[PDB]
Amino acid sequence: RAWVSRGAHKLVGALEAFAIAVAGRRCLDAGASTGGFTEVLLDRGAAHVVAADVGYGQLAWSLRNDPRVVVLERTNARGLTPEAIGGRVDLVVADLSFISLATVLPALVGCASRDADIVPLVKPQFEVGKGQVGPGGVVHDPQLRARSVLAVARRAQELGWHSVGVKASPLPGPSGNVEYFLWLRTQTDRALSAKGLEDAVHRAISEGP
Ligand SMILES: [Cl-]
């Protein structure tokens, strides 16, 4: 509940920062821990949302019963395919815990159309190496958070997916980690250059939540 509010607030921050249209589009929520992302997508006029159930907890039935929502069960983010979700989508969102986006990005890409937006939430606490998460489970070093974002961007680019924008999530995670949405597209004329991405990342880190 409180958690659904928090998820919804985060994704509105992302959609607005990036000017991504949702109306009439097919969407995938790659790790629906809360129905927050899903509710926002419905609210902003998605034609259809595939919500991948994480296997613990429970998405609200009222969400499951919505005619525009398919809850996909028994399948973590790396296992997702077009076949599994009923075809390629126009918008992919992911708020995943305890896993690096580098490992999941190939499946997410595999679920996306040519013309799609992919907007993962980069969580440095699950990207940095051992010894680098500080006291309280937070990545305190802003340069490490920046590198985290750049590493995911590099991984995406190896896959043909360019970085178009970065935006700090307006709420920190519950233990205090600042987390960052990265906007990825493969068909674009406004892809950030290396310097352009560095600038985008540095401003996002300096802004904060
Ligand atoms: Cl956190």
Distance 68 CA to ligand 1 centre (A): 31
1-209: CATH topology is Rossmann fold (3.40.50)
What b-and-e string marks burial along 54-85, b requiring 16 or more CB atoms within 10 Å of the CB? beeeebeeebeebeebbbbeebbbeebeeeeb
Burial of 143: CB neighbours in 10 Å, binned 0-12, 13-18, 19+: exposed
Domain boundaries, the chain: 1-209
In this structure, the dihedral spanned by the alpha carbons of residues 201, 34, 96 and 137, taken in order and rounded to 10 degrees, is 80
Q: What is the resolution of this structure in A?
A: 2.2
Please spell the DSSP secondary structure of the chain, one letter per residue: -HHHHHHHHHHHHHHHHHT---TT-EEEEEEESSSHHHHHHHHTT-SEEEEEE-SSS---HHHHHSTTEEEE-S--GGG--HHHHTS-EEEEEE--SSS-HHHHHHHHHHTEEEEEEEEEEE-GGGTS-TT-SBTTTB---HHHHHHHHHHHHHHHHHTT-EEEEEEE-SS--TT----EEEEEESS-S----HHHHHHHHHHHHHH--
Q: In this structure, are residues 173 and 161 in contact, taking their beta carbons and an 8 Å threshold?
A: no
Q: In 3D, which of 50, 159, 30, 183 has the Cα closest to residue 106?
A: 159
> How far separated are the first and last CA of the chain, in Å rounded?
21
What would the two tokens of residue 178 be? 């600042």
What would the two tokens of residue 138 be? 């937070």
Calculate the alpha carbon distances from 4 to 9, 42, 69, 166 in Å: 9, 14, 16, 23
Q: Which residues pair with 181 in a beta bridge?
A: 121, 167
Question: Residue holding tokens 């990545």?
Answer: 139
Rounded CA gap, 209 and 204, in Å?
Answer: 9
Ion ligand 1 neighbours, Cβ < 5 Å: 173, 175, 177
Distance 205 CA to ligand 1 centre (A): 16
Rounded CA gap, 58 and 62, in Å?
Answer: 11
Distance 57 CA to ligand 1 centre (A): 19
The structure's method of determination equals X-ray
Rounded CA gap, 209 and 206, in Å?
Answer: 9
Distance 86 CA to ligand 1 centre (A): 33
Distance 66 CA to ligand 1 centre (A): 31
Q: In this structure, are residues 107 and 133 in contact, taking their beta carbons and an 8 Å threshold?
A: no
Question: Residue holding tokens 């076949």?
Answer: 83
